[PDB]
Amino acid sequence: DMIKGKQGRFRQNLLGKRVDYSGRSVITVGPYLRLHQCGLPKKMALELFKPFIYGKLELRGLATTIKAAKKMVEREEAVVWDILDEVIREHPVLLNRAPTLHRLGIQAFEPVLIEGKAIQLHPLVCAAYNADFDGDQMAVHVPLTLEAQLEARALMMSTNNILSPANGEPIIVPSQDVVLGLYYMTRDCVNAKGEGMVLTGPKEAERLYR
Amino acid sequence: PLVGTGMERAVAVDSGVTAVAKRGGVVQYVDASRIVIKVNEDEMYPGEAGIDIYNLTKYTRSNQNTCINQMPCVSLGEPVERGDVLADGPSTDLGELALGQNMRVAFMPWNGYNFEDSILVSERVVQEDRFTTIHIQELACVSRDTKLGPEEITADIPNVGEAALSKLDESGIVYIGAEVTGGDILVGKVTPKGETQLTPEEKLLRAIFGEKASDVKDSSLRVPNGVSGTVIDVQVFTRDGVEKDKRA
Amino acid sequence: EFLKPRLVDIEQVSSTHAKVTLEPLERGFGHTLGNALRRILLSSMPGCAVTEVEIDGVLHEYSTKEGVQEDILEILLNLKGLAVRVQGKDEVILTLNKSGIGPVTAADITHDGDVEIVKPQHVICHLTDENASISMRIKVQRGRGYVPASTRIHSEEDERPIGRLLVDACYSPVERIAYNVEAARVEQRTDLDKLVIEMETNGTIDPEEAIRRAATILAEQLEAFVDLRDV
Amino acid sequence: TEFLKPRLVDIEQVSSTHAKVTLEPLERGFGHTLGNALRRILLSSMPGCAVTEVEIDGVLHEYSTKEGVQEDILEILLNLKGLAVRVQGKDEVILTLNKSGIGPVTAADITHDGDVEIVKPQHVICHLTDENASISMRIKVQRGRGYVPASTRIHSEEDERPIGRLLVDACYSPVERIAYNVEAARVEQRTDLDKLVIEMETNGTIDPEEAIRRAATILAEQLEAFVDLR
Amino acid sequence: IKELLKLGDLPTSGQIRLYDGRTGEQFERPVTVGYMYMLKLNHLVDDKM
Amino acid sequence: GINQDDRGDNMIVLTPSDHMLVPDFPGLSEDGITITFDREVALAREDAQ
Amino acid sequence: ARVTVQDAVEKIGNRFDLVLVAARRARQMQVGGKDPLVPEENDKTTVIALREIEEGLINNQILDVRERQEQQEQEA
Ligand SMILES: [Mg+2]
């Protein structure tokens, strides 16, 4: 029984492990984000990247030894947040949603530190994740080594995966609000204000509208 | 609810969360712990009647960690009839079910912050403090009898700074009303140590210094990591105890 | 060759409700100024409010006194609404002492010089016993914006007395703001507009001072903007 | 009490008429108030000079045709709308264009008057074909504030004018395009602060910075009457 | 519902003209506003995070 | 092979270890001893070596 | 940040040994045996190596020539 079966072995402990440097939280809209980035709460980011923080603090000499680095993290001074911002700069993180049906269930993003306890997810990718904002949760892993960084930015980055592996068509198509806004914008009406006046370009069109 | 169905009073009354009058009378005394009512002569027992007193229950922990608090509705000198709602249970008002709160909504897309089923909320709602709930955790420290010796609840705890003792009384229990944080020592307990076999000169040194061979280990409970609140209540259950403890 | 707006009649309908008019507004600046002032007023008006409370017989927010029917939390909720005007000092300590049966209103506060209690009828509590007595000392500070207890907890600064009860600070006096820009027929002009600002406040900041301070803040920031180095 | 005033005013001036301007330190919520106020004031109320009316020696209505110009009359009006001219002293002046021969009749070929400077001498106006190549016109330019559409003047044209009096929309304000983005910026502990990036396109004459300068100046001038705590 | 709206002196159609709180400009095509009774469920982010 | 926990405020706590080099060290005890290298701390903390 | 790696994969179409050459370069860069050939703008060493690859300065053969030159240099 210990060997065979789900609860026993191979499935559970040899194909279904439990990694470190991982987290979970509720997903949220965050419209202001760029397609290639994701909002990440400060406190989880600090907890995850703790050892990086210690390494950089010791490199800069702000702390003599590792215990002093720990104490400096537990006070949380401005320098710590500055170092965290600097280290996070190009380091990408992996986002995963519980039923990973296809390879788009795991994707890499560049995190941006934000307040709050909710993860901010770019809208366009929700269709790929089959994600809905009704209490769905997501897990977040951190690639450590240099090869992992290169792999995340090259193979897994959002901008490199625009076509579905199943068929060639685009996956990231606008879903509901975007198409409604554009539709409203483009439809014409027989008669309104400024019918049939001639404009030298779009810039004065915007001048007129605003 | 601004928009109900009328069934609210039936549900609220039939659940046992409200306090409802059994024999109608007049409210004699009103406090935020008990309501004392003088019975009406009709329902008044001839022999050995007296008056009716309803003690309310204040914040205790429910199974789901929510707060269970009752508020009085009535005032001094008001007449009450059998089957009226004296005290409001959790999330009920004057007999009616009030599960949530009614707010002014507007249906429109506001720069895709309500893109999907997500909801936008105004800072006025948090300012007015209308969606803030109280939760309640319970913690238990158990002192058993080992065969190496019973553990002790004393405040003398090896190699702890006096900061940790500051909030403990002489008996070893937190003061009611103290604000605690993660990692603070909830209660003091000592693990017995045996076969010390100290040298006689070492025993003399221990005697002068006061070091205790019996202790040297701490089984003291600590606040779980990352939870911080106020101690509202303490209870003590003693199976054998020679005498009731101070706190008892 | 321009016009410029002059502050004209300021009607006061009630102690809280006020109408302020600005007559000679150039075309197009009506909405701009209306909205700018609305924003500044709603966001940045400095006010004073109670920050923490100590009552005698109570260890923590959740206990209950004999002879009162409200819970302590409701007492804090009542204190949050107290509208007060402090003139000279930054932190004042008011003292409330009442006994016997009756509604303890805000009027019973010990009358100090520098502090003005705007609404003395504001209820605080109801006693129900002849010998029941409440004493408390309420500490009132000046500030801007909205600061809750839990954020300030990081900066506790010796919150050591367990009798202390922290209250969230709503450091903002203005409740409501509306404006209307309407055609201001000026005797030598065709198309001019007058801005009418209708404001509802808790009755602490006077309209004139509110408008003056808002204009001050906006003008100062605009001054900061005027220069551009390009160096 | 004491507020937080912006520093580090960086300006990335790619393509002199197009300027990006970044302002990282601003207080919560002032991003939209200032961006919108600035945008509206810049766009709707800005003193400038522009072409108003024109008389063609050859055509009586805007749909008639001149022989040998492939471009229609409406195209000529649209090209004349883009002419950015600055006169110093005079309020209303009437320029004449007379050109012959093959090629693009450009703004440089206009008669050189005293107070008026044409910022773009190479702006195309008309294209003249061969062997006839006769173009002559009189364009009247006036000073005014803001934007005035044709429809509002043509409404009040009960004062009958001779044929050929062709009205043109007056583009007085020198700003061609204005936009502002607000984005998150944190001072090491306070995150609810914002950066303002203002993208501005002007029509060559004055650079965007000084335009902004006089905009803020004017707004301060209106506000001056109330501010007195100093 | 129409009658009750009329008794309060509000548009019978249930839509009002609204001003954008950031910009101050009006929204085209008036929108439905009104009070709805909402509830906060037991799923609190701090427990989940 | 002496474990040195750095409490942080110029005080080291020394405790023996499984890999210490001697059966018993003359001065050391399993409960550990606190030390400070600064003479002023020593003058302020007589409980330290 | 390098938002697209399209030019680097267009340089070497395998899209895999790209990762290997970039790893070799970034490994010579991290352990400070080498120096960047492009003026850095406070980027980390990964994006530096990609920026070097996309400009055509570095590939596997350039790595091989520089390594053998360094080998013969330290050999003497
Ligand atoms: Mg969901």
Swiss-Prot record, chain F:
Quaternary assembly: Interacts with the RNAP. Has a higher affinity for the core RNAP than for the holoenzyme. Its ATPase activity is stimulated by binding to RNAP.
Name this polypeptide is given: RNA polymerase-associated protein RapA
Family (UniProt): Belongs to the SNF2/RAD54 helicase family. RapA subfamily.
Residues of the full protein shown: 727 to 775 of 968
Role played: Transcription regulator that activates transcription by stimulating RNA polymerase (RNAP) recycling in case of stress conditions such as supercoiled DNA or high salt concentrations. Probably acts by releasing the RNAP, when it is trapped or immobilized on tightly supercoiled DNA. Does not activate transcription on linear DNA. Probably not involved in DNA repair.
From Swiss-Prot, chain G:
GO MF term list: bacterial-type RNA polymerase core enzyme binding; DNA binding; DNA-directed RNA polymerase activity
Signal peptide: none
Catalytic activity: RNA(n) + a ribonucleoside 5'-triphosphate = RNA(n+1) + diphosphate
Keyword tRNA processing attributed: no
The UniProt record lists the keyword Nucleotidyltransferase: yes
Domain of life: Bacteria
Listed GO CC annotations: cytosol; cytosolic DNA-directed RNA polymerase complex; RNA polymerase complex; transcription elongation factor complex
GO biological process, one term: response to heat
UniProt entry keywords in alphabetical sequence: DNA-directed RNA polymerase, Nucleotidyltransferase, Transcription, Transferase
EC id: 2.7.7.6
Summary of the function given for this chain in its UniProt record: Promotes RNA polymerase (RNAP) assembly. Latches the N- and C-terminal regions of the beta' subunit thereby facilitating its interaction with the beta and alpha subunits.
Subunit comment: The RNAP catalytic core consists of 2 alpha, 1 beta, 1 beta' and 1 omega subunit. When a sigma factor is associated with the core the holoenzyme is formed, which can initiate transcription. The rRNA transcription and antitermination complex (rrnTAC) consists of RNAP, NusA, NusB, NusE (rpsJ), NusG, SubB, ribosomal protein S4, DNA and precursor rRNA; S4 is more flexible than other subunits.
Family according to the record: Belongs to the RNA polymerase subunit omega family.
Protein name, entry field: DNA-directed RNA polymerase subunit omega
Organism listed in the record: Escherichia coli (strain K12)
Location of this fragment in the whole protein: 2 to 77 of 91
